[PDB]
Structures are given as structure tokens and as C-alpha cells.
Amino acid sequence: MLRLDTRFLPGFPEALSRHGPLLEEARRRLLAKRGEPGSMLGWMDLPEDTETLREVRRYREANPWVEDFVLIGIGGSALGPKALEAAFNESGVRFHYLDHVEPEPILRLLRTLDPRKTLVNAVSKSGSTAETLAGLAVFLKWLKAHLGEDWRRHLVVTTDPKEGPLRAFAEREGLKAFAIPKEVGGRFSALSPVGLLPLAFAGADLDALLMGARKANETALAPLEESLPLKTALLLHLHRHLPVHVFMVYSERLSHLPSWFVQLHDESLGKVDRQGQRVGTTAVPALGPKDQHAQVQLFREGPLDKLLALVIPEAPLEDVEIPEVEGLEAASYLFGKTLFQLLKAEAEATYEALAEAGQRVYALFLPEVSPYAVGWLMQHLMWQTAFLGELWEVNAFDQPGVELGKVLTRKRLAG
């Protein structure tokens, strides 16, 4: 059960009632856009597509030879997969993310990977993302050079079902391809094959992941008092006057989740509203307890300009008891305790410390770090973001600001 804790924000229950109408209206506006072509709300439906999932799995089982999975993708095509694979890799398959174009790290891959054991997954919604095309071209030459005509079995594409150069290339070469639904933006595509394909090779429980996401869907359409997504949307809305929103996760397995959320929040809400005003808060990634040794100092004695969300697990999947050390008595207070016990204590300690310093902070508790709880959390955050899009009167599903950089890049490349 994903649980919202606002022990340090006493006025919330009342503020929720007060803003009930506003929230109901924001939700009404969003839902009224479904089915409308181009509204980009397809991410709502991904958790219900259990058939594509079985298809992804079948393909994975038909290719047990894969030892190295090279995902050539950037942004929405990489952050979700990275976040999920780092947390649920049970298969031992090695994942390499080409979410950049710096030559050296890529040459190292070409020189250390066995072509016969490598599967390249080119991922891009439009299929024309510059970085991905560049990386693909490099890996294609490599594949053909080492595998001859047997290269095609080593390249799988994930892109729009009909449009774009990747789709066309896949059709032309008879390559296996998965689809990113037309109405699903890259930023909201984590639960589509974008995330499902690599997770299948990672041997994660895809069914549990989607089960969690479907539960989040239920909370999104539930009565206000049970609509967690609307509650957290309100929390951010009520603190929209604070420029920074910190997303801190107390888990190493979920070390890549903060980055995924930063993109979700930043790219969705950093927009010009209906009123022509530049809006959006700055999402800042953090991990616990490591960031108690990097950013907490600032949260504690720096400006009171932040709204902090802490994601805390309540149980481990497999704990470890901290053993006694002869000759190291200074650590005796730890002996007998478990690592998760230390993890949880630090999370609770920091949560309190942040509140004691006057910062506005709340927590989202996860029963444990599992596909079910994480799928719930991610889908929840996508809903949160979508609702905020209504409350802030912006288009939460586009990204007008990234176009110029692409044009200027082409210019400098050509002349």
C-alpha cells in the first residue's frame, strides 16, 4: 500500500477539503481529453495492456543467448528503463545504455563486448532522435563487421508503430520491432515496451509491475479522500511558490528513479501557461542516506525554499544482520542490528530533521522495493504530474523548448 505521510504538515487535511472543488475540476478537465486524438494520454492505458507484455516475454524467451543488452536511447527512452532495470535485474544480463555520444565509452563497449552475445535495442518514439541514430549507425557497422548477415537477429527496435525512420528500417530489414503507442509520449513511456523489453531480459516480474500501475490508476479515479495522486498534486500546488522540489529516495536499487522523476516533472511542467507566464518548479534528485552527506546540510541551514518528498521503504526483501567486529568497539551500537534497520532509522531521522529545520516535507512510504510498489509509485507520479498540468494551466505533454537546440545542432554540423 503506497502511503502518504504528512505528519509534519498539520494543515493538510483541512487544505484538502478546502481545495476539493479545484482538484475535482482539474481531474475532470484531464479525463475529458481522453479518446481525443493527440491528447497524449495513452500512458493511462499501458497498465491494462497485458497482451503486449506476453509478447515481449515470448520474444525474450526465444533469445536466451543474450548476455549483454545495449539500449541505444536517450531521455524518455532511457531514464525509465535505467530506473527499472537497476532495481529489478535478476537475470544477470548486463545492460549498457547509450544515452550519449561521447566516443571513448562507446569504443570501450565495441572493444569489450562479444557481438555473438550482444543484443542492441534502438529505442526512440519519433525514431529520428539524433543521438540514437548516431549510436545506432556505429553499432550497426560493428554488428555487420563481426556477424555478417546474421546481424539482424541482434537488433530490435522500439518505436512508433507506423511513423519514423526506425520503423521503416525495421520493416526494410525484417527486424523484430515493438511499438510505443502514438498517444504515449516518451516522457510517459516507461511502462510500454520501452521499459518492458529490457526488463524482460532483466528477468523482472512484468506482471507485478503492471499490477502496481493499475492500482495507481484506481487511486487516480477514486473519491478525493482516497486519491493519493490528487493529494500529492495539491501538496506541490500549495507550495508552487517554493522554487525547488526535492525528490529523495531511500534505496540504492532505486538509485535511478530520481532522475526519471526529474525529467517527468521538469519537462512536463516547465512551461508557459495559458496566461503567458513562465511556470514550473525545479525538481532536484536525491538519494538516502548518501545525500545526508551532500545535500541535507543545505536543506537544514540553507534557505527555506524547498518542498521535499522522501520515498521510504518499510521492509527489505532480504536483510543482513550487522555482525560484531572484534577490536572495533566504537561500532558496537550497530552490532545485532540489520542493514535495513539502519536504512529505515536514517530515513526517519532525516525526515524529522528536515521538518525540525523548518522545511516543508512529506513522505511516500513503499511496503518494499518491488515491481508492484514501484509500478504503483511511477504511475502515481505520472498522474500527479498530469493533474498539476491542469492546476497550472500548461500543456504537460509537449516539449516546445527542445526544438531550437536541435536546429542549432544541425547548423553547426553542416557548416
Next chain:
Amino acid sequence: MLRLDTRFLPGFPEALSRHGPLLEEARRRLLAKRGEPGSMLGWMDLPEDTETLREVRRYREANPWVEDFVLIGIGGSALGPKALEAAFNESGVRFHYLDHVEPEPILRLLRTLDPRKTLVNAVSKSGSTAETLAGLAVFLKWLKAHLGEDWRRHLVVTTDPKEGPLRAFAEREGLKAFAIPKEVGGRFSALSPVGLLPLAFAGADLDALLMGARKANETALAPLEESLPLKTALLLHLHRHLPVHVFMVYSERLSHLPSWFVQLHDESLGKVDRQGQRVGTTAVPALGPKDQHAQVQLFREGPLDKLLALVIPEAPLEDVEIPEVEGLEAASYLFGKTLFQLLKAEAEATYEALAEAGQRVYALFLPEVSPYAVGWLMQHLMWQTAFLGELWEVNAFDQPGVELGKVLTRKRLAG
């Protein structure tokens, strides 16, 4: 040679001139503090220690059996090492960082690493950091159980030369130990054995790293016009009221540098000044070009409340030509160009786009990503930060805010 570019900040030359006296005094105040025990300015001298790096090299050479290096450390004892090792690993030795206490990831390491090929490095300045003592306890049991009498050779300690439980433990057990100078704080310890030891096993050029840092020391003492650290200190100072400071690096090899800077900036300047006021800006990490697909959208159309610094390399160490692909004509504009050429184009393009959007942005150019250039950059930033400590009238070398969390943690664990 590091290069500062302020092409999109036309009023900077006048501002530098006008604030000349202020900057000169900030520098004088900092330098006047040297010599005085407890000033925590030992990081200025690390580049001139031409004895310790030899000792580090000899130790490494005497242990060519290491295939896996497990660094148990957090915050200042982990970020510097991660940033450096990720950028300069030439040996292929696999590094594992215990900068957390979540049970599963650690259990995975205990079950997949070969004890005979593993070297454990416990790093902590105080020697009593909770997370590190817990991680060490666990690995100690593991080492003893699988290595017998030869366990001691697989554990090396990096801590204060005289204080703390780690120092005492190392002397009691006859373990190899390296020293973090008394006057060197954790977040300023990257060029001490904290970073030198792991870098040695990574096969990187330690000498070049310190030489580059020495160059930065020179710039810190140079005439104002040539003192890059005082110039960037001014830039951050002139935007001290803006809540956010983005640090974006256009390199994958340096993917861990932003995190290192965030701790350096946040923990040092997020303080209560001498007038009792809360000060400090929020450092936000970013990587190029991947963040053009995640955070740039917000920088482009969101609030103009940031000062952005872009770190851009000017040359690759080894480039890669993007090969033409038969059947992928939509990518022909990339054929013939190189990966670095693309990287550079995107960096310049984004730098300009950010300025076009009205954001206060500047760039720091590195000749290439090398120990020399990066050592220069890191030392430059430490000076920048120390100068800012004077300009903002705060103690940039302590961290009062993290104590409560530790106290509450012990309280929780006890009961």
C-alpha cells in the same frame, strides 16, 4: 588550460572591474587563514604532496591481483572517487561503491565477488561514519570466512592519521593505511589518498591529476584578470539570490562529476552566515546531451531563476566516425561526421539556446577530458567555493546541519 566563456553575459567585464576590490579582499581573507591550525585549508596543499602518490603507486603495484575494488565510504569519501574512477579507469579493475546500507545490493556483491580477487578499502575521515562502519562490519565477516589468515591483505584503510576508530582498528590489526590530512575536510578530499588510491588501481595518471590541480592553485593566486576561480566565484555571487545553480557537464566519462560538485557547493555554502541569515543556492546536476531531453525544457520555458554553468570539452582523446547506413537515409546528415563532433555541436547549440531563452549562462571549456584538465577543474571549483565562503560570510568548511540526523538515527536504533 581551463577557459571561461561569458559571451552571453555582456556586462561581466564591467562587473568584474567594479567588484575587483571585493574579490581581492575575499581572497586575502581566505589566504590569511592558512597556517592557523583548524582552518581546514589543507586541500590547497594536496597538489604539492609528491611523496604520497608514490607511496600509493608502490602499494598498488605490490597488489596486481586485485580485479575488484570495493570502496566502503560515503559522501566525501565516495563522490570524489566515483567522479575520478568513472572518467579515468584504464585498467579494467571493477569498482563497487558501498555508499549506502540497503541489504540486497550488498548481498549481491557478497555472492558474486571472488574474495581472492577483492580488495576492500574502508574510507572515512572521522573513521566513525555509521554507514561505513556497518558496511565494513559485514565485509569483515566475509573476508575472514573466505580468506582465513590472508584477510588482512584484502583490507586497506584510508582515514585520519591519528583520530577515530578506523585508525585504531588498522593499527591493531596491522592493516595498510593511508591518511586523510587533518586539515583536509571530507568534501575537499578528492586529491588525497581518498581518490588517489582507487585511481591507482584504475591505472590513471595520478601525477597529471595533481599537476592540473597545481595549475588551478596558480590561477587562484593570479592577477584578477587571470584568476578564473575569482571570476566564477563572482558569477555565482552576482546570482546569490537566485535559488538554483545548474552544473551541466557534456561528457559521459565525467557523469559522476556533477554529484561531486553538488556536495561541494551545497554542503559548503548552505549555511547560516555571520549575520544569522540562511544562505546558499541549490546546485542542480545535469549531463549533456542527455539532459537536453529532461531538464533543458524547464530551463528554456520555465522561470528565469537559475545561473547555469556548462562544462564543455574541446577535443576527444579518441574519436569515432559515424558510418553511413544503407537504408537509413534520414540519418545521412550525420554520416561522415564524428561522435565528438556531434557532442560538441550539441553543447554549443544548447549553450546558445539557453541564452536565447534568457537564462544567465556561462561555460567552462576543458581542452579534453584528462586527469590534467579535470584535476584543474576540480581544484578550480574548490577555490571558487572557498572564495564564495568569504563573499557570503559563512564557514565553508564545516557542516552543523548533519548532526541531528545522526543523533536521531542512534536514538531510533537504540529504542
